[PDB]
Amino acid sequence: TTPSMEDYIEQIYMLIEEKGYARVSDIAEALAVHPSSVTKMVQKLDKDEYLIYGLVLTSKGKKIGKRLVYRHELLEQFLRIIGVDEEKIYNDVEGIEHHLSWNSIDRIGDLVQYFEEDDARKKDLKSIQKK
Amino acid sequence: TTPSMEDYIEQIYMLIEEKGYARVSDIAEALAVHPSSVTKMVQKLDKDEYLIYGLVLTSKGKKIGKRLVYRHELLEQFLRIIGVDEEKIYNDVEGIEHHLSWNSIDRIGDLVQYFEEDDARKKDLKSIQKK
Fold it and tell me: Sorted alphabetically, which keywords does the UniProt record give (chains A, B)?
């Protein structure tokens, strides 16, 4: 499960949910890569049984894809809550998402919940930045 | 300033602070890489003027090195504070450190300060994990 493989699974999952299907051409455009690079990964994803062949995810691929989408969203919410400039959030998440253990993701989930459940906490955090 | 280059500068800075100098053999062992690779990277750092040649950092290299060590330390503090298993922290930081903008680092700094000025906040956060 490499970072690249994860980016592909996350994108395929999102396209299926968005359009109802995922074409190699839409993946190439979404990730800004050459279609041959897409064909190579797709074959690896099929061999590793994450999907079949247009592109259809297996239960294995769907489970991981849902987790990857959840992880990405959680991390954007994390950086957003702590005050990171919105414009910078996507690129940072795209890079760090692949290097956090599930344990760290669980704890970041708790941290997000901590601030989401009581706005007063968000206000107090903001006060720190103000200094 | 690629992730690999940053790992090298971080290690060189630390070795100089640790032993007083940085041998190529020590950099190789520290990063678990073959000496040949170290030679190649050192030539690049020398060209980009981060150091001169044993290995002595320029003010440019020292400034970056200090910030990289600070960044790594802050990130360990952050994962430690939110409850990540200590054994998992180093590896997560090693990977995410290169993918966080300075804006994200500054905000994580404020977040760590937020929890440090009131133990009650740490307690409330821990309760969420406990639950």
Answer: Activator, Cadmium, Cytoplasm, DNA-binding, Manganese, Metal-binding, Repressor, Transcription, Transcription regulation
Quote the strand ranges of chain A, DSSP E: 51-52, 56-57
Query: Is A84's CB within 8 Å of B107's CB?
Result: yes
A83 reaches B (C-beta below 8 A) = yes
DSSP bridge pairs for B52: B56
Q: Closest Cα of chain A to B52: distance in Å?
A: 31
Contact check, Cβ <8 Å, A83/B107: yes
Tokens describing residue A24: 């190699």
Contact indicator for A107, A73 with CB cutoff of 8 Å? no
Same domain (yes/no): A63, A88: no
Are A84 and B91 inside 8 Å of each other by CB? Answer: no
| Cα gap A74→A108, rounded to integer Å | 8
Residue type, B117: E
| Same-domain status, A55 and A84 | no
Q: In terms of Cα–Cα distance, which of A35, A67, A29, A28 is closest to A50?
A: A67
> Whole-angstrom Cα distance, residue A1 to residue A99?
11
Please check whether residues B3 and B63 belong to one and the same domain.
Answer: yes
Residue at which a domain ends, from B49, B68, B87: B68
Element (H, E) at B110: helix B102-116
Question: B35 CB contacts (<8 Å, ≥6 apart)?
Answer: B24, B25, B28
Cβ-contact A101, B92 below 8 angstroms? yes
The secondary structure of B55-84 as a DSSP string is: -EE-HHHHHHHHHHHHHHHHHHHHHHHTT-
- Specify the CATH number for the domain of residue B39: 1.10.10.10
Structural domain count, chain B: 2
